[PDB]
Symmetry: C3
Subunit: 117 residues, 3 copies
C-alpha cells in the first residue's frame, strides 16, 4: 500500500513518528504486510477546505484490491479518520480521504513489477 | 472536487488568495458546490516543461462524473487555462492540466465515504 | 509523459540537473518525444519505506498507452531503476515506482485537451 498525508500544517507541528504510527495503522486497517507499506508526508503545503485555510489534511490511500468498494472503504475511512483526527488534532470536517485501487502490473520494484515477484 | 496546483514558482511569487479565487473558479467551471471544492497549492517545487525550467504549473482536477470525456474537459481546460494564465502570468505553453474522474466510494468524509452521505 | 520524483532527500542533496537527465531518460525509456515530457521533483518530504526513514524515493510515471502492461512496465522499471539508483545513490530496496496510464482526453494543453491537438 501507499499512504500519502498532505497538510497545511508545518512540519514542526506534525507529531514526531507520525509516519511510523501511520505505517502501522495502515497495515492493520487494510490488512496488508507492514513492511510493504509506504508512507509519505507533505507538510506545509497550502490547503483550502470548505473555503477555509485553517489546518486540514488529505489522505491518499492506494492499494491492491482492498479499496475498490464503498463497502470496505467505509470501514477503512472510519479507522483512518479515528487515527488522523486523534494524531493531528483536527476535526472530521478538516480531513478528506481518497482511495485509489491499484494492480501489481503498475507497481515497480527491484527493476521489474509486482506481477513478476 | 479536488484541485491541485503545483508550480516551480515560489510561494512569495504566488498571488495572495489564489486558492480562494481558484476554489470559486472551480465550482463555476465544473458546476459543483463551492463549499465542497478542495484546493491545494504546492509552490517552490522543481518543474521542467518542454525541456525548460522557466516558471510553469500543473493543474490536477479530480471530480465525480464531470471530467470523464474529451467533450467536457475541452470546455473545462479552456476556462482553467484562461484563469491560470491570467492569475499566474504564464503563457499557455507553461501550463498543463490533468483530469481524474472519481467515484463517491473512493472519497472519505466524516468517518465514512460519500456513498453513504 | 509525466514523471514525478518524491524523496526524503533534501534539495541540496539532489544532483543538479537531475530533472534534465531524468527528462531525457524518460523520453528514451518510454519512447516519447523529449519536449513533451514533464518532470517534477518534490525533495525534503517525509518518507518511510520498509518501516525505515533512511533516504528513499518514489517515482510516478504517467503516460499514454505505454505503461499499461506488466510486460512493458518490467522493461521500464529496469531502466528507471538503473537510472535512479545511479543518480540518487540509493539501493533498489529504497526506490518504488508506480505507473499510471493516461488518455489524451484527460490531458489539458493550450486551453483544450490532447484529444483536439
Ligand atoms: C503496498 C503493498 C505492496 C506489497 C508488495 C509486496 C508484498 C506485499 C505488499 N506493494 C505496494 N504497496
Ligand atoms: C468534490 C466535491 C465533493 C462533494 C461532497 C459533498 C457534496 C458535494 C460535493 N466531494 C469531493 N470533491
Ligand atoms: C506526455 C507526453 C505528451 C505529449 C503531448 C504532445 C505530443 C507528444 C506527447 N503529453 C503529456 N505527457
Ligand atoms: Cl513545513
Ligand atoms: Cl493553507
Ligand atoms: Cl497493496
Ligand atoms: Cl516557496
Ligand atoms: Cl524548477
Ligand atoms: Cl465531485
Ligand atoms: Cl529540501
Ligand atoms: Cl523521512
Ligand atoms: Cl504520453
Ligand atoms: Na513531517
Ligand atoms: Na502558496
Ligand atoms: Na530539486
Amino acid at each position: 500500500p501507499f499512504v500519502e498525508l498532505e497538510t497545511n500544517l508545518p512540519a514542526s507541528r506534525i507529531p514526531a513518528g507520525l509516519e511510523n504510527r501511520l505505517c502501522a495503522a495502515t497495515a492493520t486497517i487494510l490488512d496488508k504486510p507492514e513492511d510493504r507499506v509506504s508512507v509519505t508526508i507533505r507538510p506545509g503545503m497550502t490547503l483550502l477546505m470548505n473555503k477555509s485555510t485553517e489546518p486540514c489534511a488529505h489522505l491518499l490511500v492506494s492499494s491492491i484490491g482492498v479499496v475498490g468498494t464503498a463497502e470496505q472503504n467505509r470501514t477503512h475511512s472510519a479507522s483512518f479518520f479515528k487515527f488522523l483526527t486523534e494524531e493531528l488534532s483536527l476535526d472530521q470536517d478538516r480531513i478528506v480521504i481518497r482511495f485509489f485501487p491499484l494492480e501489481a502490473w503498475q507497481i515497480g520494484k527491484k527493476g521489474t513489477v509486482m506481477t513478476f515477484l
